[PDB]
Design a protein around this ligand. Structure first.
Ligand SMILES: *[C@@H]1O[C@H](CO)[C@@H](O[C@@H]2O[C@H](CO)[C@@H](O[C@@H]3O[C@H](CO)[C@@H](O)[C@H](O)[C@@H]3O)[C@H](O)[C@H]2NC(C)=O)[C@H](O)[C@H]1NC(C)=O
Ligand SMILES: *[C@@H]1O[C@H](CO)[C@@H](O[C@@H]2O[C@H](CO)[C@@H](O[C@@H]3O[C@H](CO)[C@@H](O)[C@H](O)[C@@H]3O)[C@H](O)[C@H]2NC(C)=O)[C@H](O)[C@H]1NC(C)=O
Ligand SMILES: *[C@@H]1O[C@H](CO)[C@@H](O[C@@H]2O[C@H](CO)[C@@H](O[C@@H]3O[C@H](CO)[C@@H](O)[C@H](O)[C@@H]3O)[C@H](O)[C@H]2NC(C)=O)[C@H](O)[C@H]1NC(C)=O
Ligand SMILES: *[C@@H]1O[C@H](CO)[C@@H](O[C@@H]2O[C@H](CO)[C@@H](O[C@@H]3O[C@H](CO)[C@@H](O)[C@H](O)[C@@H]3O)[C@H](O)[C@H]2NC(C)=O)[C@H](O)[C@H]1NC(C)=O
Ligand SMILES: *[C@@H]1O[C@H](CO)[C@@H](O[C@@H]2O[C@H](CO)[C@@H](O[C@@H]3O[C@H](CO)[C@@H](O)[C@H](O)[C@@H]3O)[C@H](O)[C@H]2NC(C)=O)[C@H](O)[C@H]1NC(C)=O
Lengths: 345, 345, 345, 345, 345
């Protein structure tokens, strides 16, 4: 008979009145576009720009009764992407694009299949730079939720309706990792139905749960800031009269706590509000700070100076055995009131 | 009757004389374009480039009496964005673009509605890289103001006038945060009316107030630089004759003040004039610097050396009890003359 | 006779029925496209974005019987790249593009040669920003495998089949280096044959083995962190009663281990899970940490204090000669259980 | 009468012989294009790429006698930017573009006004990434001069001549700052008249004088490196026999000078030749270096050891009072021969 | 007579048979294209991407006998860049582009001049991002060679031949600097004549010799690492029994050598193989490392302990005078075997 590329020019040409600027079922029921995506790549979750990029296969299915045919024998036709301007396509856009583009390598990466009863499959390949606001109040112990919503732009709710299909709405490719986060296998699928002063515009969204890994911040930032506080408690076991040994220990410890803190503020993000890791590196500074000011109290009582001269040594050794036990206990109370309050949020 | 996409080709074609290069109300009163924006995204406020990017919905409403109609029954038509070149559009441009682009994902994100009496709604989606000069003289305690102005380019004041509409001129999306600043809910709306040697060009602007958050700079930079100055005053309570303990304290303290200062100059911005945080890390260096030079004065008087040999110890202990009280008081006077002068600006 | 540029317009014009939207051997056997690439450049293997860019010569060969000819005398014609839209080209795309583009400098860098029997050579020049997920669990001792796969987009398995040619499928240019990795001369060539709900789409892939060089991390990060652990064992040979010498050595060594660790966390990548180098800089911190706590045990036993007063010195010298030998031996056990477990993975 | 958009199509159509590829006054006197710019934005003066970006209004005025008219009543017409290809425009380009682009937001930002006698105004909006070589031999004390030149490309000197207009050739917008430099209000305006083997091509240039601000480098780099040199002179006033106090002072001072130096080499630019700030941080290292080697000379003479045993103490106290005065004087001679030689260049 | 823009449409129109897809001298001798470039800008030589960008004037001269004319009186015509698609242009491409683009600011920066006998001058303006592999084995003392080669793409050796002209093939603009390198005035010009399985393709290349400047690395990295090794030899002149002074000197010196090393690894490039500067900062670490282990040998022999008790002091002072001279001599032998081996390569 006649080839499919010439059959579609007969179906959508100047004859048959198919105007590509008019939706199907015009002045009637709204077009029911069903959508499902397929994530190929997912990463570079920035926290200064607060965005993340994704590389999807956006599939769209709707019904168009003007494209139904019965003369041609085979079931599923296909339109070349160069002739794609002669099809009513839904004006889908992402409500938080923040920049995006298509792919045009060796062929426009666009697919169109017109079925026999009028069903139309439309699959394209988009690289998105989608934006999600991130809340870094508890920085190592956080669970991020970055949304992905698909509004309509020009058609209102009574003309065009988006829906996720009932069989695998959001898939993820198998071999896909992240440098910091992990992607949970729990995709929430819900409506949003945006309102304006213009009208009710449809939208569907898919939420992704991003859990941050921990093992770098414990090994490099919590454990070295733990051992420096333990070294600051060695001063309680060294003799009281060894005066160059005590202040040489108490201040080289607050120097290696400052070096550990300042050396790791470049690896941390640059938000301007107090994190979880920022509290830990400011309270572990206090336990090294409060372990010299006891020696400012120990060496001053012993220097006051008959049994009255022996009483001041008897009080300086009293405060050297209280704080020998109190500082490994007050730091343990903080070590409980820090992890419990961040495993509960 | 006839479809809307064929009704606009009759209205704006070679018939009816609608020339798209000629403004409405030609050789008469000026066109009154009323505008309102809708910010979707707002962030990446750079301070080296001195710019910020915004993602807006630019809505424009004017009146074009050549587009009025009464034969077609429905009230609001719509033109497809492929046929948008047959409409007089206002030549709005941002006076501080510094680069911008449209969005063309799955459809040109452009909307046009011609009402029955001739009112025209025109809504597009722009990603701007707008520029605002920033004044970082008092860096943690600053209130930035970044403008957003909308000039005309080719039409003068007697041909085209921009105005903000009287009902919600600038909206902001709800779930929108910033890494460093916060966005106040107070938008100043005013005219600017730019002049040149060419003529009076209209412009309307919208100012955004950006208050900088504080909690990172106190916990990581002010409080750790505070505790180092407190540790430098421990030298006044340690004994005078403990010579390896005093200079081992006074210089490991100026080393941990240099380590705290140099480790945080990478997180700070890179402007070349003195900030608020740069005065603090240069005066807190002086109090550690002036706490060794007293011991250079203490140890030198005691080394001068009968009651004349006991007078020099009596003067060295005098200056070790004056500066034991004076340095926590002179530093308190600076700590009042620093925050009061930056909560008043 | 007639020129070749006018002979191809007769062969592919409105006459002869050559429709460029229809594959050869239509409704018959599938088109056998044979492919081979030629890497010109290869580098910038990022580990935050997890991608790498490559600059290839993509050559494609297929058979198109509608382009066969016998009237023109010469064997191989050539079509100009401006007239390239009148050829059925395969819709090859890379399944992990993550952005790509052509090259259009002084001429479209595209080549087409139609042979006499219908064989078609098609060579283009593409810059890819291909993505490979990287596994930095053992960071200096790792072997990366970054794939490069070539799917079809619109044609299924029974219409278009990709194959590597049997003579040099993947070549690499000669003078081509890398900043960190080395590129092995072993290219795995295999099929993948992706399935969807749409159909069987063909794909061929080529794997590249990337081995990381070592010489920077040994000279700058392993050997300097080795010598600091050796300096921390000098404390066992210095006298027991030299109390400012022991704690002055044990804590300036944990300060130069913190300075070596924090100064090198900027050169390392910023993944959030524990590496191989991150274990080494956390266990070598413990051996400097555990060499002061022995002196907290030595100086405390000697301070307890007749032959009972001489027994406590006899036990403090016992633990000062056990750990004089034990710490160079326990660190040797870790130095065997660290390299063996990373030369075996 | 007739509208202006239809009057210019009569004036420049297929009738009247106006060919847009032929300059006015053909085979006669050269076209005198007078130019003036208007800088909107100016910043991001990079010193690794050695470029700076500017956002200008480029106005061009020439005479075109083929566009003169007398039938239409009004004085100044205007051509829409879509119809701008039917005008002879001068082929102005910037000789050091290094990348540039136009602006096309909501309308092409282009302006054209044909006057009655034939004078043509042409104003566009360009974002340039202009390049200027920078000479960082004396880095904080430098005055940069970055040119901006406007050549012709295809027409020689006897066909097209560029000139700055005699009334405000280069303006700058009012509220315009820079992060590091300041922009002087003194614009040099001169010709360059480039020669090649092709011919004499015209060019005009405008020079901008950029003076670098100072207040950050004094407060953060010169004054903290000054106070460390003063602390290194405290060793001359401490007693000679206090041997752990002297070398503990002289080497913790060369450590805080190294920490001040290495902590600030990330904020400095990364050129590979010696700056002004690089001499200051290498000579102030010597004054701390030369304050320990005197103590290596003090402690060695006193250790040589009857009145001959008292002569070695009598010489060690001689060199401890010479260098008590000499080092605050030799450093003052350097402090004069450093600022005078950099305020004179 | 007739204008030049209408004479070229007569010469290259549908009349006269000039087909722009066919080279001159078809089925005859190959076209001899002679080329010469003119570098406007040259910089941003990256070593992570291993590329450099250049901004050139590419001039091409060939002969086309179909464009010869004798009726028009003047010698040199010119074609407007809008009508440039009706000219056979050579398909020159750079073999290592790695991305490039043209310049289209106020006019397409393209020049074409057709002489009377058929000689065709063609000058364009290209911004290249050319790639050169760099060998950083001896990093401060290196001489880089970055090539620039110009292949043909579609025409083989028997159809199109590139040559450099015999009079100034590569010029460089006068006022042109670099941040790190210097550009030598010695350009090698040679052929390469690439082979494939496709055929012999012509290519000509130009080599640029880049020499790295030295003065920053001596002043900031070699001299401060030199003076720290000199300070580590002060320990040999201080008294043997001053035990807190020796280990306080030997380990604050290995701390300021680690601070000098770790603070400068951010300014160095990030290749993963050992450099020249990386050997220097790892051998100068050993001379500070081996200056404490001698004191571990000095203090241990003196602690062994009648004239047998005086023999151990007599051996400890022997090794304190051998290594007083040996370490300034062994370090001098390394200082000769380090510069001589890097001035010879
Ligand atoms: C696309 O989806 C819309 C909404 O999901 C469909 O519109 C709905 O059509 C059904 C039947 O065609 C109607 O709902 C029910 O109809 C019965 C019979 O008239 C009536 O008794 C019920 O009270 C109810 O209205 C209704 O017209 C309409 N809306 C809703 C909310 O159900 C539409 O059919 C779908 N397909 C197309 C091609 O548009
Ligand atoms: C667009 O806005 C402009 C300015 O806002 C309008 O022009 C103004 O039109 C009004 C009446 O149409 C005039 O103002 C007053 O008119 C009365 C009656 O003639 C006169 O007695 C007053 O002295 C005053 O002029 C005036 O012509 C004009 N300008 C101002 C400043 O009021 C215009 O009508 C608006 N609409 C359109 C479609 O252009
Ligand atoms: C392109 O490649 C395909 C598959 O590689 C080729 O299709 C294969 O064609 C061969 C012979 O033309 C057939 O295989 C065998 O054919 C014999 C003879 O009929 C039969 O007895 C065997 O049982 C077997 O089917 C077969 O039709 C087909 N598929 C396979 C799997 O062999 C094709 O010929 C190639 N060329 C073109 C121009 O498409
Ligand atoms: C554009 O500018 C050029 C140069 O600035 C103008 O060309 C100059 O025209 C003037 C008079 O039209 C001539 O200069 C003098 O002319 C008198 C009278 O013939 C003669 O006695 C003098 O010796 C001198 O040549 C001259 O032809 C020409 N060049 C110079 C250097 O003055 C031109 O008129 C301007 N306008 C246009 C529309 O091209
Ligand atoms: C472009 O360049 C090519 C090669 O440089 C030129 O081709 C050469 O043309 C010359 C003479 O036209 C020939 O070389 C010699 O010719 C003499 C006389 O026939 C013969 O006796 C010698 O043995 C030698 O072949 C030759 O045909 C050819 N190739 C070489 C290698 O010399 C060509 O003429 C240049 N011009 C054009 C417009 O193509």
């Amino acid at each position: 008979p006649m080839p499919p590329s010439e059959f579609l020019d007969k179906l959508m040409g100047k004859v048959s009145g198919y105007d590509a600027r008019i939706r199907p079922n015009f002045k009637g029921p709204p077009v029911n576009v069903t959508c499902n995506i397929f994530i190929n790549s997912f990463g570079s979750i920035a926290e200064t720009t607060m965005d993340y990029r994704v590389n999807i296969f956006l599939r769209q299915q709707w019904n168009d009764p003007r494209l139904a045919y019965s003369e041609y024998p085979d079931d599923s036709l296909d339109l070349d992407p160069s002739m794609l301007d002669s099809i009513w396509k839904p004006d889908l856009f992402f409500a938080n694009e923040k920049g995006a583009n298509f792919h045009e390598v060796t062929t426009d990466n666009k697919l169109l299949r017109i079925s026999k009863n009028g069903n139309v499959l439309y699959s394209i390949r988009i690289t998105l730079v989608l934006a999600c606001p991130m809340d870094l109040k508890n920085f190592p112990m956080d669970v991020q939720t970055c949304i992905m919503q698909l509004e309509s732009f020009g058609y209102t709710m009574n003309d065009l309706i988006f829906e996720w299909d009932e069989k695998g709405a959001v898939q993820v490719a198998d071999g896909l990792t992240l440098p910091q986060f992990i992607l949970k296998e729990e995709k929430d699928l819900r409506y949003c139905t945006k309102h304006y002063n213009t009208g009710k515009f449809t939208c569907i969204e898919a939420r992704f749960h991003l859990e941050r890994q921990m093992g770098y911040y414990l090994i490099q930032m919590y454990i070295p800031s733990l051992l420096i506080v333990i070294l600051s408690w060695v001063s309680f076991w060294i003799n009281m009269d060894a005066a160059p040994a005590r202040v040489g220990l108490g201040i080289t410890t607050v120097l290696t706590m400052t070096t550990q803190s300042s050396g790791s503020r470049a690896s941390l993000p640059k938000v301007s509000y107090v994190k979880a890791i920022d509290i830990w590196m400011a309270v572990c500074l206090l336990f090294v700070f409060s372990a010299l000011l006891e020696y400012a109290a120990v060496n001053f009582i012993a220097r006051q100076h008959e049994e009255m001269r022996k009483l001041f040594i008897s009080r300086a050794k009293r405060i050297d055995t209280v704080s020998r036990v109190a500082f490994p206990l007050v730091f343990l109370i903080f070590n409980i009131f820090y992890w419990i309050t961040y495993k509960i949020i």
